[PDB]
Amino acid sequence: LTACPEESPLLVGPMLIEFNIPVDLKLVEQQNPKVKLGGRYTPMDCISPHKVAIIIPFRNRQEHLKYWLYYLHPILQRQQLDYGIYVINQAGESMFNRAKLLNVGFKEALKDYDYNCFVFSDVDLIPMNDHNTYRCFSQPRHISVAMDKFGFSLPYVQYFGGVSALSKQQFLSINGFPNNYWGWGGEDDDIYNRLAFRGMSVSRPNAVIGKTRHIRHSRDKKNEPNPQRFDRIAHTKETMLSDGLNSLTYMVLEVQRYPLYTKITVDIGTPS
Ligand SMILES: O=c1ccn([C@@H]2O[C@H](COP(=O)(O)OP(=O)(O)O[C@H]3O[C@H](CO)[C@H](O)[C@H](O)[C@H]3O)[C@@H](O)[C@H]2O)c(=O)[nH]1
Numbered sequence: 669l670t671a672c673p674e675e676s677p678l679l680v681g682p683m684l685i686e687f688n689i690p691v692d693l694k695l696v697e698q699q700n701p702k703v704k705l706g707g708r709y710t711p712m713d714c715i716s717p718h719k720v721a722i723i724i725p726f727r728n729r730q731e732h733l734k735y736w737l738y739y740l741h742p743i744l745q746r747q748q749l750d751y752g753i754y755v756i757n758q759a760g761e762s763m764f765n766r767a768k769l770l771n772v773g774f775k776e777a778l779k780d781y782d783y784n785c786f787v788f789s790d791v792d793l794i795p796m797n798d799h800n801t802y803r804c805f806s807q808p809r810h811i812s813v814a815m816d817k818f819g820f821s822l823p824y825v826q827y828f829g830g831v832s833a834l835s836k837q838q839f840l841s842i843n844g845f846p847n848n849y850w851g852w853g854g855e856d857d858d859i860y861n862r863l864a865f866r867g868m869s870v871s872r873p874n875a876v877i878g879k880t881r882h883i884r885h886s887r888d889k890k891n892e893p894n895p896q897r898f899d900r901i902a903h904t905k906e907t908m909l910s911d912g913l914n915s916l917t918y919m920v921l922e923v924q925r926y927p928l929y930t931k932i933t934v935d936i937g938t939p940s
Pocket residue numbers: 724725726727728729764766789790791792793829830831851852853854855856887888889891
């Protein structure tokens with residue numbers, strides 16, 4: 669077998685993405701027979717150099733996940749990636765911690781396979797163009813650059829929210845993501861700050877092929893705006909060395925392998 673082409677020859681470009689249609693994971697599993705237990709997929713015709721672990725922070729978003737799975741699997745296969753889906757479900761009813769869950773994802777996924785690339789994605793963001801490859805690049809990759817919720821514009825040039833990708837080494841070089849951001853906001857700016865502090869830059873696809881749709885939803889109880897985010901992000905320089913991968917603690921309560929993804933339910937503690 670030879671190395672897959674640089675550009676998948678299966679891409680179709682723009683696609684129609686809509687969320688008023690109800691979904692059935694059974695049909696999805698059927699329509700994607702190539703996807704193995706735990707939502708694992710490995711190209712058959714060639715050797716993909718992208719061993720992608722796709723991490724999804726999660727709690728009470730089953731319907732969104734449904735759409736996410738319905739749309740992404742077909743796309744990730746067309747992108748010729750050797751990938752796996754990880755839904756990191758936060759146990760309990762305490763404050764949501766997106767960044768911490770992503771860290772857990774990084775660690776737990778590595779126990780399964782020698783992934784060298786990590787895509788961190790909100791459960792509610794779907795790419796509108798399969799040319800927007802869910803893989804890693806020479807530099808940290810911001811993937812959801814043109815969100816319809818922001819009218820296809822980047823809210824500000826340093827925005828790193830939504831969907832992003834870091835290679836194993838890029839992730840490691842910044843001591844991962846912070847674990848101290850409880851509730852909504854700022855964790856993505858901290859991560860951006862970490863990348864810059866390590867002397868890295870953000871790579872992005874152009875605003876056309878980077879178009880993506882957000883599933884409209886209301887706010888979630890237990891993920892209210894974090895009032896401390898403003899000055900927490902103003903101090904990333906001093907906290908990234910001690911807050912991150914090296915200080916990550918958590919308890920996996922249960923691991924379940926479904927046909928389209930692996931669900932890891934974890935106790936990641938509470939704000940202190
Ligand atoms: O109860 C919750 C809360 C959050 N999430 C997960 O965390 C993500 C972000 O939460 P929301 O979609 O409510 O957040 P927003 O739409 O504001 O998302 C945007 O703002 C966030 C602020 O923390 C993040 O930066 C995120 O990546 C960015 O796209 C969700 O997609 C989902 O994957 C859950 O599963 N359950």
